[PDB]
Symmetry: C2
Subunit: 226 residues, 2 copies
């Protein structure tokens, strides 16, 4: 059983599947870094509580887009909203504000997730993010813009393990193929997610599998606490 | 063609019989108990600082299919407001809809506020006033106070020329921790047809939706298309 609520892991558990409208295709850093991929690092500060620090490698392995993550959580309160499992099983819509990080040839992002708490309060999770390409080839450095998200969380009635079924749609806003990497996302792409986590000493792992359809911005994934 | 109002404002109008009621709450599922005859769903939707929808719907089985047939009348909308000006974001937030019994007319009632995100970063409130009455004289379940918790995502079909909305939602009942033949009609996946006849500020339109619902898991999948 996960020592943290599933919704707190959603943002850590592949922005290359975002729908970039045609007029914005030149601003899609994430696909342009493929197939070699990018490193995505975040600090997630849960206000009045602890923080996650994450580092992920997102790249193709053959036909599969893989997101392999190491997560480290510290300074959490034993019966705060996170370790005390006080968060509703849902995930609100957010805007992910992206800016170029020119001299590191990557991007940064900032956004604040709002997790609904059982008692009607809200638990904020302030995200700071930086992505750096792994490969040597040129990438697309964007003008400032944002990604707007929508997500539904559910359970598989046949799954006895602790798990999360996720469906999300993400579209870019706020501004032929623009990169060769973009062409690797033309159809439905299988996804593998592997997370190794330690939060206040509670060790855990998550494996997710599913597929993404970047033309529509859609992700469908099932995650299992292994 | 293009609807005169934003799709998100029609989501609540466009089948609560597909809510997942947990086993211990099965004696609180009015919506399924009214089946298969059905129920009349009537709403006032008051958009803050703007117009209002009045809606009248018939929700019943047409043989195998669960059908939601609605008449909507929208009045007093500002031509440059958030609704007629199409200034609402294409999403739909999670809500808790509080259900109470309306014993005197053998149905339920609900008052809830939808918060529609506006393009300028603000919110457009839509206060909903709902009343549901069973269509027949048979027995129905009048529930204790509880709520429905919803999650919805809206999307588009990239090759659909017509104004349309792809919708997926999960809804589960909650708020009771204590523990009908219509219930049997939802044992598996049920096909759904939605037909809406609309008039907002004199702009007439129609919507047709098709999909299915699985009340055992609370899941609804529908594609809606403008048909006039």
């Amino acid at each position: 059983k996960l020592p943290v609520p599933w919704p707190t892991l959603v943002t850590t558990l592949v922005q290359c599947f975002s729908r970039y409208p045609d007029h914005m295709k030149r601003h899609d850093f994430f696909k342009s870094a493929m197939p070699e991929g990018y490193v995505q690092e975040r600090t997630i500060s849960f206000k009045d509580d602890g923080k996650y620090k994450t580092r992920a490698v997102v790249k193709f392995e053959g036909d599969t887009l893989v997101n392999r993550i190491e997560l480290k959580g510290t300074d959490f309160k034993e019966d705060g909203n996170i370790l005390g499992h006080k968060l509703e099983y849902n995930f609100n819509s957010h805007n992910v504000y992206i800016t170029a990080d020119k001299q590191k040839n990557g991007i940064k992002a900032n956004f604040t997730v709002r997790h609904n708490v059982e008692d009607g309060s809200v638990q904020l999770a302030d995200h700071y993010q930086q992505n750096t390409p792994i490969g040597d080839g040129p990438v697309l450095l964007p003008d400032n813009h944002y990604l707007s998200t929508q997500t539904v969380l559910s359970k598989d009635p046949n799954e006895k393990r602790d798990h999360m079924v996720l469906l999300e749609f993400v579209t870019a806003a706020g501004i032929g193929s623009a990169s060769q990497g973009e062409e690797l996302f033309t159809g439905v792409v299988p996804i593998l997610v592997e997370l190794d986590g330690d939060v206040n000493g509670h060790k855990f792992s998550v494996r997710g599998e599913g597929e993404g359809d970047a033309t529509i911005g859609k992700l469908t994934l099932k995650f299992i606490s292994t």
